[PDB]
Structures are given as structure tokens and as C-alpha cells.
């Protein structure tokens, strides 16, 4: 049964998709240590987001699954008879799920803490981290889109899957030839907004453009709505996260009576502070469920965000340099051979990442070891599952097939660069397997990825339902 799995993955890989293109791919079974499987296995690739694997797998060693992250509200001394502070700070310790709503509770609570006016500045403060906001070899022209928001350690998560560094920008149409009515979401007095967007005739054709042009805090919108087309939103990132998160914190002050005298804006608490009064302070959920809307939806910020907090847990210091090299360590010390590796980031996002299929397949046998492994396996998308926080990225792959609700796998994908690594368990045989393709220049060879993991399945054990 081993030699018709292997003619049937070597037909799959013959498509004319994958023309031109290198393309690792290792199949192993996780219980008897059987090579199912192998082409190219040593060969060192582009993962994009599959890099997440190596990531997840290291916080996970260095935090652990019991990890949780903090936020404090600080002032230099308690609020006196008269409710009075100075200069007021706002302290990430990088949490990358903090809400709108958390800083209302965290608002909440200063102003039971006694706090009525805020006579002085409010400082956010976001020292914790570097100020290195973006990976050198970054595309400039991918900046203002949500996958490639700034890095801080005090952010803003919008939303259930936590999509950090960003607000939501809403277009709705009007009557046409009149300008179509732009929200800016939380960035609303935050961020500048140059609308140009225009109603077009109903059942014209839209064109807008949602934009934040390079090195400025502007969103620019352009192009036309037609008058009939449903209203729109769009995530955009912004300059500096934490002054966003500053501004929204003077926000949520003023809504539960705490007056904001001065003025906001980036600073770390002075350190000719003596003994610093926390007047509110917030407690993330613990890394095993923040792994979740990390790994499911493939949030890039949580990548950056762990590699800087293993920084600072292994040398004090919320740096990509620090953080990186116990990237590796943790990985080492959990028996991957890390030879292939190259690190430049935590998500993937970076074109200096690269890995080997076998480094690959090497840490997801590794894993199952240690005792985090179910969390883990969890966080993984589950393919063709419709719960965007089972499937994740998978959700619209694999429906209707033997993989359907039995794939756990990492994606990742970039221009010229496919994958998708993971799990296929099943009575015939516990599968680990990694699909790296680089070089294809036409569609993205998910059929070609999903042929072989539906084939897997069947190989497990699995039938198509029907
Ligand atoms: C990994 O390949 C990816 C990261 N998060 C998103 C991004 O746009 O970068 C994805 C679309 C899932 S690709
Ligand atoms: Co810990
Ligand atoms: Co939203
Ligand atoms: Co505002
Ligand atoms: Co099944």
C-alpha cells in the first residue's frame, strides 16, 4: 500500500501548476517513524506562514502553555483627597489580544480607584518591546494592510480573532455624484482622513481604493461606490499602535468621569518614579487560547509580538535579535535539528525566512512529545470545517472530502510561495506531513496541496463522504 501512495502523490505532482516551480514534500508516520514519503525533503524553502509552527512551537517551550500577558495603568502616586493625578501611564507588557473593551474596564477601575482628573499628560507606554516596528526586509508597500501592522508591545486587538495594530475604515455610498461617508473606526481622531471616494450610478462598477500612502498617518480613500452596492469595511493598519491604544485609553477615561487635562502621546514611565501607584492593570487569557485566533487565522502581529516576549523571558530584551536566537534554542532543546532553519521572523512574513520539508516534519514529530502537544494540535486550522475558529484558514478547502474535519495544518502563501504542513490522523496510520512550494507562477497550487492531503486521509483511513 506504500508504493501506490507513492505513484498517486507523484501524478499529483506532475500538474502543470507546479511548472518551474521547487516543491518539498515529506510524508512520515508519527507512530512507527515510517518514511511514507519524500521528495526534496532537504531542499531550503520559503515557508511564509508555515514559519508560524517553528514559533508557536518555541513559545510555547519558553512561556508555556500557562503563560498570560499583562497591561497596567500607572500615576507616581495614588489620587488624594481631591481625585487628582499628574501625568498618567499606560503600560503594555505585550498582550496581543487587549480590547477597546479592556481599556474601558481597566478606565473603570481608575476611576474607582479614586481618580477624577487627570491634571497632567497621558503617556503610553510600550518600553517592554524595542520601537522596531517593522522586519528590514518588510515591502513598504504592503504597510497599510492588517498581516503587516506595526509592532509594539502596547496594541490594540480589534475584534473576536484579535487583529492587532489596526483600525476598521467603513465606506458607505450615498446618492450618486455625492461623496461616499467614511468611518475610520477606532482611528477616528487618531489618524488623518483624505476622502476622495465618490457615489457612483447604481450598478456601476466599484473601484474604491482603501489606502494609507507609506510614512504617513493619513487613510486615503479614492475611486467610486456604486449607490447600490452593500457598505463596506476594511482593516487598515496605523502609524504607531500604542498612541492609538493612548488615544483610545483617554477615550474610555473620559466615558467613566476622569477628566484628561493634558495631552497623549508616547513615553515610558520616568524612572525617578519612586515607587509607581498601578491604579488598573489587565490579565490576558493564558497562551494556550491565545493560540487559537493566532494560529487559526494566522495573525502575523501575535507572531512578532511571542518572538519579542521570548526576548524578554530569555534575556530582557523585547527585541527581534534576542528573541530569534531562543527561537532556535527552544526548538534545539526539543530535539529539531534547526541546520535548515533561517529565521528573520516569527510569521512568515519575511522573504529571509527559510526551512526544509524534513525540518519541518522533524519539529511536528517533535511536538507530539512534549507535554503541550494537544494544545498545540488545537490551535491548528481544521480543514473544510465552517466555524472560521475550526477551520480557520482552511474552512473553504477540503469540503465534502475524507479531509474534511480530520486535517490539521498549517497554511502560508506569499507570490510564488504555497504551503501547508501538518497532521492526518486516523486508525491506519497517525500522519505528518509538509507541502513547501516556491517558484510556481500561475495559481496558487492549493489543488495540488489539497489532492495530497485528501489522498492522505484516505491513507489514514478515511472515506469520502457522500
Ligand atoms: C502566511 O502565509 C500568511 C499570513 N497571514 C496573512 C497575510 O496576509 O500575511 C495570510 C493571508 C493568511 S498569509
Ligand atoms: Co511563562
Ligand atoms: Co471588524
Ligand atoms: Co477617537
Ligand atoms: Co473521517
Redesign the pocket.
Known amino acids: 500500500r506504500l508504493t501506490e501512495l507513492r505513484e498517486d502523490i507523484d501524478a499529483i505532482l506532475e500538474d502543470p501548476a507546479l511548472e518551474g516551480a521547487v516543491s518539498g514534500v515529506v510524508v512520515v508516520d508519527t507512530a512507527t517513524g515510517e518514511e511514507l514519503y519524500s521528495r526534496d525533503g532537504g531542499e531550503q524553502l520559503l515557508p ?5 509552527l517553528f514559533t508557536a512551537a518555541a513559545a510555547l517551550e519558553v512561556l508555556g502553555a500557562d503563560h498570560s500577558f499583562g497591561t497596567e495603568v500607572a500615576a507616581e502616586s495614588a489620587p488624594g483627597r481631591r481625585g487628582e493625578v499628574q501625568d498618567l501611564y499606560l503600560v503594555g507588557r505585550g498582550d496581543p489580544t487587549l480590547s477597546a473593551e479592556d481599556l474601558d474596564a481597566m478606565a473603570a477601575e481608575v476611576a474607582a480607584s479614586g481618580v477624577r482628573t487627570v491634571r497632567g499628560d497621558l503617556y503610553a507606554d510600550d518600553t517592554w518591546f524595542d520601537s522596531e516596528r517593522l522586519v528590514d526586509d518588510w515591502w513598504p508597500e504592503d504597510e497599510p ?4 501592522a506595526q509592532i509594539s508591545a502596547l496594541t490594540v486587538a480589534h475584534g473576536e480573532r484579535f487583529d492587532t495594530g489596526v483600525t476598521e475604515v467603513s465606506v458607505t455610498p450615498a446618492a450618486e455624484g455625492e461623496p461616499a461617508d467614511v468611518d475610520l473606526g477606532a482611528a477616528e481622531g487618531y489618524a488623518e482622513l483624505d476622502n476622495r471616494a465618490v457615489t457612483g450610478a447604481a450598478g456601476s462598477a466599484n473601484t474604491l481604493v482603501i489606502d494609507r500612502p507609506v510614512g504617513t498617518n493619513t487613510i486615503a480613500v479614492t475611486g467610486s461606490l456604486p449607490a447600490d452596492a452593500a457598505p463596506v469595511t476594511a482593516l487598515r493598519t496605523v502609524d504607531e499602535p500604542a498612541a492609538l491604544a493612548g488615544h483610545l485609553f483617554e477615550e474610555a477615561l473620559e466615558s467613566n468621569g476622569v477628566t484628561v487635562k493634558g495631552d497623549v502621546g508616547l513615553g515610558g514611565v520616568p524612572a525617578d518614579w519612586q515607587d509607581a501607584e498601578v491604579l488598573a492593570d489587565h490579565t490576558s487569557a493564558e497562551l494556550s487560547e491565545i493560540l487559537v485566533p493566532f494560529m487559526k ?4 502581529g501575535h507572531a512578532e509580538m511571542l518572538v519579542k516576549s521570548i526576548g524578554q523571558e530569555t534575556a530582557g530584551a523585547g527585541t527581534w535579535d534576542a528573541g530569534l536566537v531562543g527561537v532556535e534554542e527552544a526548538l534545539s532543546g526539543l530535539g529539531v535539528d534547526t541546520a535548515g532553519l533561517v529565521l528573520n521572523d516569527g ?3 519575511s522573504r529571509g525566512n527559510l526551512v526544509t520539508a524534513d525540518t519541518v516534519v522533524d519539529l511536528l514529530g517533535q511536538a507530539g512529545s512534549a507535554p503541550w502537544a494537544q494544545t498545540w494540535s488545537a490551535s491548528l486550522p481544521v480543514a473544510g470545517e465552517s466555524d472560521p475558529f475550526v477551520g480557520g ?1 482552511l474552512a473553504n478547502r477540503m469540503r465534502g472530502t475524507a479531509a474534511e474535519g480530520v486535517v490539521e495544518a498549517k ?4 507570490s510564488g ?1 504555497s ?1 501547508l504542513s501538518g497532521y492526518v490522523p486516523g486508525p491506519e496510520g497517525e500522519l505528518a506531513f509538509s507541502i513547501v512550494n516556491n517558484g510556481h507562477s500561475g495559481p496558487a497550487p492549493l489543488a495540488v496541496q489539497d489532492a495530497i492531503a485528501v489522498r492522505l486521509a484516505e491513507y489514514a483511513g478515511h472515506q469520502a463522504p457522500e
Open positions: 511564509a506562514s508555515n514559519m508560524k494592510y492588517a498581516y503587516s487565522f494566522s495573525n502575523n510569521s512568515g512574513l484558514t497554511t502560508g502563501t506569499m510561495v504551503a
